[PDB]
Amino acid sequence: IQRRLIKSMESVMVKYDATVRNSINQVVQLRYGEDGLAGESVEFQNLATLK
Amino acid sequence: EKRLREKEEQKKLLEQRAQYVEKTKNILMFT
């Protein structure tokens, strides 16, 4: 399963126009994670006006 | 402004009536 996932997504990359694209240059996401943010810097918080 | 918009709703409704009275003769000669 790991090998299959890797070979399926290996060339998907964040481009300099900030879009996420595969080797064919097709657009997979207009911004990474729908927000264009890297996963190392984000963290858990609470929306104070929701509940 | 809401009154104007509801009046536009009424004018559109009568417009659809004014075209449905045409469409019923076509539906009549259809079958």
Binding site: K15, Y16, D17, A18, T19, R21, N25 | -
Partner: protein, 82 residues
């Protein structure tokens, strides 16, 4: 592409920093002139990092866009974070 309007980020990416530092360190190791002053540094990597902190690395990063165009940024024009 209009250099007056470059759409890419004004920050140097971690990969740009890595490759620029490696490239400049190799250039220093191959007896290229150093752009900053030196106290006692003899390791090319330390000299390259000092040049990057001083914003005195004579390299241009050619960032390619998916459409095929490119944007040229001087290492001094980018924002160095780390």
């Amino acid at each position: 592409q209009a250099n007056q309007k470059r759409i890419t980020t004004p920050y140097m990416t971690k990969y740009e920093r890595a490759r620029v530092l490696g490239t400049r360190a190799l250039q220093i190791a191959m007896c290229a002139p150093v752009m900053v002053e030196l106290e006692g540094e003899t390791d090319p990597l330390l000299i390259a990092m000092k040049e990057l902190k001083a914003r005195k690395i004579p390299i241009i990063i050619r960032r390619y866009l998916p459409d095929g165009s490119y944007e040229d940024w001087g290492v001094d024009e980018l924002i160095i974070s780390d």
